[PDB]
Structures are given as C-alpha cells and as structure tokens.
Nucleic acid binder design. Structure first.
Ligand SMILES: Nc1nc2c(ncn2[C@H]2C[C@H](O)[C@@H](COP(=O)(O)OP(=O)(O)OP(=O)(O)O)O2)c(=O)[nH]1
Ligand SMILES: [Mg+2]
Ligand SMILES: [Mg+2]
Length: 373
DNA sequence: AGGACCC
DNA sequence: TGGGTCCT
C-alpha cells in the first residue's frame, strides 16, 4: 500500500440538470434554478449569457432578460438523484465519499491493480488514456504510475458513461494520486469531460491556482488569516516558515495545509454510507412574531418525519435552529438540542410541543433530526 | 452549542 | 444569502 488512484466525480450544474430532465422543454433554453432571491445554479446555455452561480435574480435578468427560472427550494428530487449517483459509483467500487449533493470520491486503487493483473505482458503496451491528460503531458508507458493512472482514467470514463446511460446525467471526472489533486484536476476541462493528472505535472497544477483560498481545505477564514501574514500565492505558503505558521494556526491546521500547498494530501476516501442527519430549512422575509409562527415548524416536521421514516433507522436527537435580524451578523445561529422520548420514537403531536418547549427556551427556522441508530 | 469548511 | 460533515 502506497500509490493510490483516486477519481473525483463532479456533475455539471446539478440542480439545473435535474430540472431539465423533468421538463424537457426547458432544455436549450437558458435555465436558472432559484431559491428565494438567488440563482444558486444555471445550465451552461445560461452561463454563456452572463448568468453566474449564486447571482441575484435581478442581476440575473438584467443580464439575461429571458432567463427561465424554476424554484429549487425543495431539495427532494436533487437529493434523490444524488444518492442514485453515489449508489451507481459504489457498484464500481464500495469506498465512495460524498461531498455535497453532486461530488463523489472513489478510491480505485484496488480496482486498478486487479485490472492490471489481468492484462498480459504485451497488451500492457496498448494501454491508452480516456479523456484529457493534464498539461498535455507525455505518457511514459514504462512508468507503472502512468499505467495505473491511465487505467484509472478508463474506469472513470466507464463511470461517466454509466451515469449518463443509467441516469441521464453528464459530469466531469478527475483522476489523480490523491483527493486534493483529483478534485483540482476534475475541473480543468469543465463541461462534461475528464482529465487525468500525471505526477510530473503536480506542481504545474498547484501553481496554476491564483490564491490559497482556491485550495480544497483552506476556507474563507484561514485564507484571511494567511493574508494577514503576507501569504497570498500558493508558493508563498510552500515557502513560508513552518514554525510561524505552526504557532499561529495550530500544529494541526498548519502542518496539514502546508502539505496541501505542495499537492500532498494523505486523507483516505471515507465511505459516506447513509446520512448522519436530516434537516429542512425555511428562510423568510423576517416574518416571525416569535410565536404562533411555529406552524412553520409543523411543516418542517411533516416532511422530515416522512424522510426520517423512509430511511429506516430512527433518530435519537432533535434540534431547532434560528436567526435574528439586525446589523451585518456575518455569522449568527442558535440551536437547542435535546433527546427524543424513546416512546415517541416508535406521531407529530408529541414532537410538535417537544420542539415548542425547545423554542421558548430561545428570520430562519430549521429542524434537524440527528444521532441516528 | 458553536465553529469551520464544502457544495 | 438549503443542506451536510466533523472537530472543539
Ligand atoms: N444553495 C446552494 N447550492 C449550492 C452551493 N454550492 C453549490 N450548490 C448547488 C447548486 C448546484 O445544483 C449543485 C452543484 O454544486 P457545484 O459546486 O458542483 O456547481 P454546479 O453543479 O452547479 O456547476 P459546475 O460543477 O460549476 O458545472 O449544488 C451553495 O453555496 N448554496
Ligand atoms: Mg461541484
Ligand atoms: Mg458539480
């Protein structure tokens, strides 16, 4: 165990794809999926006419006064397609990690080896790549790593073909030696295509980024922290002092993100399996009188109980979260967590008041069933 | 309970 | 600015 072959699968404008499949007439027409006053995503037809992901509806129409919009506030169908995608990938190989509703990581290492052991000391020279080779790098057929990654690209091509034939979905794939690289390379050729990264091009890929914030693992916060330290480019982070970074972000975050700056990342692909929680939200124009407005909470449970049910397992914890309007609270949420009566587990009425008591003890409102068993 | 990070 | 995961 050492050299891994990882694939990162990323779908094209996921919500938009699901909507276009539902109502065909929406195809070829610029399509935007809306949630409240946002256009969370849109089909490529729309991205051509200026529409960008997460853009105000207005700024969206005064940019494309023809953009068709559909409401994507109810995630039911997106969530269902998302699991169908994951299950299909799991068939190729069980260790699949979900990242959001449209990205999956699959460790193909075991699968690549088995396929190689099947080839003969001849046809192994006929091994070819499927899709793009990052930085148009030359393949060396005598390099065992090159061969493994190429088989990896073949598998990826099979997965994408399967996703399309069995689910009607198009998407990108990135093949590399680790999750970091696979995720970074899957987006090089953006629409419905795939790319494989050979080792000699790792630094080229990492340095192609324009800021550290672009590195998976480095968020909005850490990015700002690094700035205040004079660290802006990927090379700055690579060359920065381990000590100062270690003594200001924690030996953990520090030693880990500096590895990332070099394209190094040994995190394993984790088998996501069933969800660890179930939650539904509802933001509204500061329309909550602090009371009686819990009829909204009854709505949430309605679906949640239907979802938590279907699943099979039962939650042993419930929660409520809220927000409050005022200044520019860049981060402000509150929640009251509490166990669920063993009797009530095995229906709404009880739960309703249960959340109500949790309510009083305290713009948005969301119930979250967690601690599944 | 709250925080950070991600899609 | 509709959901999730895991760490402090
Ligand atoms: N509400 C919300 N949805 C998001 C956010 N980031 C991504 N999504 C949603 C909208 C898309 O249908 C779906 C896919 O996310 P992605 O980051 O992969 O982008 P997308 O598939 O939309 O397009 P792309 O991969 O760039 O072709 O997830 C976010 O911050 N908020
Ligand atoms: Mg994505
Ligand atoms: Mg995507």
């Amino acid at each position: 165990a050492s050299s891994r072959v990882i694939v990162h699968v990323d779908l094209d404008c996921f919500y938009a794809q699901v909507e276009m499949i539902s109502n065909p007439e929406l195809k070829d027409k610029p399509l935007g999926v809306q949630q409240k006053y946002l256009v969370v995503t849109c089909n490529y037809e729309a991205r051509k006419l200026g529409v960008k992901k997460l853009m105000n509806v207005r700024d969206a129409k005064e940019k494309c006064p023809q953009l068709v919009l559909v409401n994507g506030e109810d995630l039911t169908r997106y969530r269902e397609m998302s699991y169908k995608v994951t299950e299909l990938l799991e068939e190729f190989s069980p260790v699949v990690e979900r990242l959001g509703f449209d990205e999956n990581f699959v460790d193909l290492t075991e699968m690549v080896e088995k396929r190689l052991q099947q080839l003969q000391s001849d046809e192994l020279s006929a091994v070819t790549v499927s899709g793009h080779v990052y930085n148009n790098q030359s393949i060396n057929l005598l390099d065992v790593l090159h061969i493994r990654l190429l088989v990896g690209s073949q598998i990826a091509a099979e997965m994408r073909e399967a996703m399309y034939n069995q689910l009607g979905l198009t998407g990108c794939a990135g093949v590399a030696s680790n999750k970091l690289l696979a995720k970074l390379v899957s987006g090089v050729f953006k629409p419905n295509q795939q790319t494989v990264l050979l080792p000699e091009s790792c630094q080229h890929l990492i340095h192609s980024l324009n800021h550290i914030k672009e590195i998976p693992g480095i968020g909005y916060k850490t990015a700002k922290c690094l700035e205040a330290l004079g660290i802006n480019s990927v090379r700055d982070l690579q060359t920065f002092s381990p000590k100062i970074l270690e003594k200001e972000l924690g030996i953990s975050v520090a030693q880990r993100i500096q590895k990332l700056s070099f394209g190094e990342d040994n995190s394993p692909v984790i088998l996501s399996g069933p969800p660890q929680s179930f939650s539904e939200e509802d933001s509204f124009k500061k329309c909550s009188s602090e009371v009686e407005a819990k009829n909204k909470i009854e709505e949430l449970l309605a679906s949640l109980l239907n979802r938590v049910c279907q699943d099979g397992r039962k939650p042993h914890t419930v929660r409520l979260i809220i927000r409050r309007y005022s200044s520019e609270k860049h981060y402000g949420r509150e929640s009251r967590q509490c166990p669920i009566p063993s009797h009530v587990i095995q229906v709404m009425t009880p739960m309703v008041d249960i959340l109500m008591k949790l309510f009083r003890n305290m713009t948005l409102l969301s119930v979250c069933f967690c601690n599944l068993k």
